[PDB]
Amino acid sequence: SLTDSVYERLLSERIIFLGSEVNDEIANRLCAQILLLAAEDASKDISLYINSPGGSISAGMAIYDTMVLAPCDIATYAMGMAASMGEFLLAAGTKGKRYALPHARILMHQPLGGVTGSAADIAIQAEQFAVIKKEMFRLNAEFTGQPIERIEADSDRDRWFTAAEALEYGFVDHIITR
């Protein structure tokens, strides 16, 4: 597999890719990679490249807490989409190290949570979802330096930011050109 060979070679360069879904399987794979790189050498940075439509809110939070506990700066890059949890992660990189490429598109929006189980369970999953989402909005407000009211006004609409706008808004610190 050329695809897996390339990613192992990149993992040794301390580069992690998030290319899709942010579901429970992807979150566990990324959490494992962050923990592994930090374990191998905590004195060095990890670069996370994001090109993803997003996914489950709980999966994105698992990745986020792993990024935080890992004792190493994590740089993040929007190299296409950083949508929903893809944005959350992008914005969660450390300060001065959040980047977007010029044609990157950043979507601050909310996950849908997802409906499973019996009517009795659906009614409960919705409460846990509302709680997680409230925390997602608090954190985006802190990551971007915005009032939480703006985060809600924008996340509840399908509002896309251009890379230049994402920088002005506070999701991104720098645009990478050459």
Partner: protein, 181 residues
């Protein structure tokens, strides 16, 4: 003619396992036709079913209450979830059940217009609370129990025997057996 058709001639609607929105329309068509054929004659509805979609069973409920002819209901076998509303909905004095009949009060399952809204969890949970409210309210109007009581039982999947169903207000009588030997 085969039964079912003989039953229709006798003004009997037999509500079975076919509880899809598609079949709810057949039950409503049968009620509308029997009323026009003779508005002053009772319609008997036999119920033996594992619930069904709540939205379409409420459509039947309104048709049953709309219709001028008395509708009497007989529970044979099952009257699960939502079918218990239709059972309770028959004209008072005419709700009946056989001794091994079981009436199952359950929260309604998710159905109806669940086409693919983005916020499915917030929306569908809202639909669920609305459906639960209608089931609790509708049973309270037909059973005499406060909707709050019904909720406590609904949340625990309470299953009523034909006799308990009288005490709970769904059934007016439990049908006797006729032993000839």
């Amino acid at each position: 003619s085969n039964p079912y058709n003989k039953l229709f001639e006798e003004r009997i609607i037999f509500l079975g396992v076919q509880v899809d929105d598609a079949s709810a329309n057949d039950i409503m068509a049968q009620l509308l036709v029997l009323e026009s054929l003779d508005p002053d004659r009772d319609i008997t509805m036999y119920i033996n079913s594992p619930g069904g979609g709540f939205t379409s069973l409420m459509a039947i409920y309104d048709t049953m209450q709309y219709v001028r002819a008395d509708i009497q209901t007989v529970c044979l076998g099952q009257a699960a979830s939502a079918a218990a509303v239709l059972l309770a909905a028959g004209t008072p004095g005419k709700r009946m059940a056989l001794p091994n009949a079981r009436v199952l009060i359950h929260q309604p399952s998710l159905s109806g217009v669940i086409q693919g809204q983005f916020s499915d969890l917030e929306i569908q949970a809202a639909e669920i609370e609305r459906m639960r409210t209608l089931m609790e309210t509708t049973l309270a109007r037909h059973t005499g129990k406060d909707a709050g009581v019904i909720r406590k039982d609904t949340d625990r999947d309470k299953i009523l025997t034909a006799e308990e169903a009288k005490d709970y207000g769904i059934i007016d009588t439990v049908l006797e057996y006729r032993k000839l030997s």
